[PDB]
């Protein structure tokens, strides 16, 4: 599972957007008297010629900036978490079912637990939605939508089949011992001198 732009792009491009939205009002020329006041016989310094001091002139202080990055620091962070969830499916191509079988061998019946959360793990998945939107960041799980579906469904089918096979074996035990004990009770020897 790759990212065609790596997750760092999701933050870098948003930073470039914020930089554009700053420079749209920041790179404005500074009003100056040098038009005729040639007595400043010196190349206009960039810090003063382009008016690069507006950030120190916040009416509300730096809080806006503290807010701005915060939004990004939120927007990227959780969505990377979302990406992380997708990366969690990486096992579907490199995992040994024998390890799972040994770890959960003879669970409640055979597994009875993880097979329940697998259906929930089918979330972020198996929906008509093709691309997850979040703010201006859209992650398109279009190339994997079918491949991970096939792999996950095959693994689900094999796990379900093994669960059912063990379930049926235990039900052979179930019904066989019921029948035997029912016959033993149906001997019905209630009155006897012995």
């Amino acid at each position: 599972i790759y990212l065609n732009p790596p997750i760092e792009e999701c933050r870098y491009k948003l930073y470039q957007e914020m930089f554009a939205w700053k420079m749209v009002v920041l790179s404005l020329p500074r009003i100056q008297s040098q038009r005729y006041q040639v007595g400043v016989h010196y190349e206009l310094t960039e810090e003063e010629k382009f008016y690069r001091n507006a950030l120190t002139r916040m009416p509300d202080g730096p809080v806006a900036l503290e807010e701005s990055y915060s939004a990004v620091m939120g927007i990227v962070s959780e969505v990377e978490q979302y990406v992380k969830v997708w990366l969690q499916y990486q096992c579907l191509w490199d995992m040994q079912a024998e390890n799972i079988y040994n770890r959960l061998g003879e669970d409640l019946n055979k597994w009875q637990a993880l097979l329940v959360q697998i259906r929930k793990a089918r979330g972020t998945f198996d929906n008509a939605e093709t691309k997850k939107e979040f703010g201006p960041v859209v992650i398109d799980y279009g190339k994997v939508q079918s491949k991970v579906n096939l792999k996950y469904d095959s693994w689900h089918k094999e796990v379900l089949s093994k669960f059912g096979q063990m379930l049926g074996s235990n039900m052979t035990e179930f019904h066989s011992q019921i029948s035997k004990s029912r016959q033993e009770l149906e001997q019905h020897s209630v009155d006897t001198a012995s």
């Binding site: 760092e8 900036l65 990055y69 040994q96 799972i100 993880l114």
Partner: protein, 311 residues
């Protein structure tokens, strides 16, 4: 639940990521130029506040691709709170921090460097790192410093944060121009190099000279950055033989290795203050012509009353 254990335990071969290399430096010191030239493009775009560069480090020996997070910070002190975005307790143990000392203006190096000596320190305590972890990282960094094969002392790592620190000084080529345009003596270069080495020794830092114009040690800087943040193989020796470009590995520094640099200059003792030895760059821009105030009507009429009075 159960899945988050079962699938997670099925981990494969990988290379560690999520490293946050940090860059504080004096504003206008070409820090963005240096790092952009490092990452491959000639130069990105500058701006205000924190800026992001994702450094793409590829290891051909293992043939893998990874990205580190260059969070380059503005030189304005007013933009120091937003540094709380740069370093977190989750990110601290893998942060490598470098300064940009614009050698074209040596007179503004040390204190700006010493400006570091406050900011990060404040940020490293206001985030309230528990003593146990900060001590363990500190001793781990100390041990890593000790074992440099190609040291103990009174002031070695006498004050440090336990994370790798570099002091890279850009615009190296300018040393030539200020050599002639300022008659800046070679003994001055020796003095500033010794002072910077003492600084990097007390913070356990590795110091690298570089010039984007002369593209010197950029490959070496890349090698050292990757070697420190990741642990790649390193083979470059301590290039200190020539003054033009000097490379001090973190651990190669010793007090005697600075006394040897002390001896060859005999003009002014190094114990004297930094700014005393270096010459100040005089301010060029003249003061604006004074306000030509007009005497208001009231005191003018007072003076005219007096004039009509003595007559």
């Amino acid at each position: 639940s159960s899945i988050l254990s079962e699938v997670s335990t099925r981990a494969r071969s990988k290379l560690p990521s999520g490293k946050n290399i940090l860059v504080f430096g004096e504003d206008g010191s070409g820090k963005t130029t240096l790092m952009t030239k490092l990452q491959g493009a000639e130069h990105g775009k500058k701006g205000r506040g924190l800026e992001y560069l994702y450094l793409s480090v590829h290891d051909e020996d293992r043939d893998d691709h990874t990205r580190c997070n260059v969070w380059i910070l503005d030189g304005d002190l007013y933009h120091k709170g937003l540094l709380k975005f740069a370093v977190s307790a989750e990110s601290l143990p893998e942060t490598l921090v470098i300064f940009v000392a614009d050698m074209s203006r040596p007179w503004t190096v040390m204190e700006s460097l010493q400006k570091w000596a406050s900011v990060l320190r404040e940020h490293i305590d206001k985030m309230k790192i528990p003593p146990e972890k900060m001590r363990e990282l500190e001793r781990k960094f100390v041990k890593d410093f000790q074992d440099y094969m190609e040291p103990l002392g009174d002031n070695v790592l006498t004050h440090n944060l336990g994370i790798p620190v570099l002091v890279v000084c850009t615009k190296c080529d300018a040393v030539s121009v200020l050599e002639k345009e300022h008659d800046y003596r070679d003994e001055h270069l020796d003095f500033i190099q010794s002072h910077l080495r003492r600084f990097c020794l007390q913070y356990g830092a590795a110091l690298i000279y570089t010039s984007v114009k002369e593209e010197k040690n950029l490959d070496l800087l890349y090698k050292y950055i990757v070697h420190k943040t990741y642990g790649f193989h390193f083979t470059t020796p301590a290039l200190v033989v020539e003054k033009d470009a000097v490379f001090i590995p973190a651990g190669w520094d010793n007090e005697k290795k600075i006394a040897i640099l002390h001896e060859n200059f005999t003009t002014v003792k190094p114990e004297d203050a930094y700014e005393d030895f270096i010459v100040k760059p005089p301010v060029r821009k003249l003061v604006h012509d004074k306000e030509l105030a007009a005497e208001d009507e009231q005191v003018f009429l007072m003076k005219q009353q007096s004039l009509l009075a003595k007559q």
